[PDB]
Amino acid sequence: TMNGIPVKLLNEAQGHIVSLELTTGATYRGKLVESEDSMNVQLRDVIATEPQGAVTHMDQIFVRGSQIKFIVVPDLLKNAPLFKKNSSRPMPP
């Protein structure tokens, strides 16, 4: 349908280091390969913190989208174009 600024921003951060905390307590942090429309993400070369603290390492992971609590994208995407309020799209096809 329409997605709006947060899920579209998550699609703007494909390729860069993100840090996300699931709803079970874990914290995964790696390069985000493919996100999807339902905030269903993959992550490559991640550093996986278990809830009681034991950090391990694992090559790829596919979290369910429904379990995410937040996703911490890089800082420069503050200046992303989708946050521009007055936009002038040229013409439909």
């Binding site: 600024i5 429904s66 946050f83």
Partner: protein, 123 residues
């Protein structure tokens, strides 16, 4: 601080909200986007919590002081299933008159941009 009575979440962009969540945590950050599912995008948020140890100090019976864990998170997006309430904390960096001036200036620049793009593609 005083917020206008008829001010929904669409109108509080660039305020500094204080979003409560399902776990006692609180994300004090500047709002800049939201959605139908109410999953915000906080700019400079600081995820706080009250620990399991100092939670006895809040139990009902000078003042009370609680030591919270400020944990800085830069440009989070939240998941809207978790949110519980939002409370405004601080007003923006700009005024209202200054935001009016800057919004007219941005719209003027966008219309000049589309004018030049159209007259360049016709040439």
């Amino acid at each position: 601080i005083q917020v206008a009575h008829s001010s929904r979440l669409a109108n509080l962009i660039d305020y500094k909200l204080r979003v409560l969540t399902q776990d006692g945590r609180v994300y004090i950050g500047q709002l800049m986007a939201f959605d139908k599912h109410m999953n915000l995008v906080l700019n400079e948020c600081i995820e706080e919590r009250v620990p399991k140890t100092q939670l006895d100090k809040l139990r009902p019976r000078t003042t009370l002081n609680i030591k919270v864990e400020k944990r800085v998170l830069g440009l989070t997006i939240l998941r809207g299933e978790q949110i519980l309430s939002t409370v405004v904390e601080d007003k923006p960096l700009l005024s209202k008159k200054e935001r009016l001036v800057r919004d007219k200036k941005e719209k003027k620049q966008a219309q000049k941009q589309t004018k030049l793009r159209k007259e360049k593609e016709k040439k």
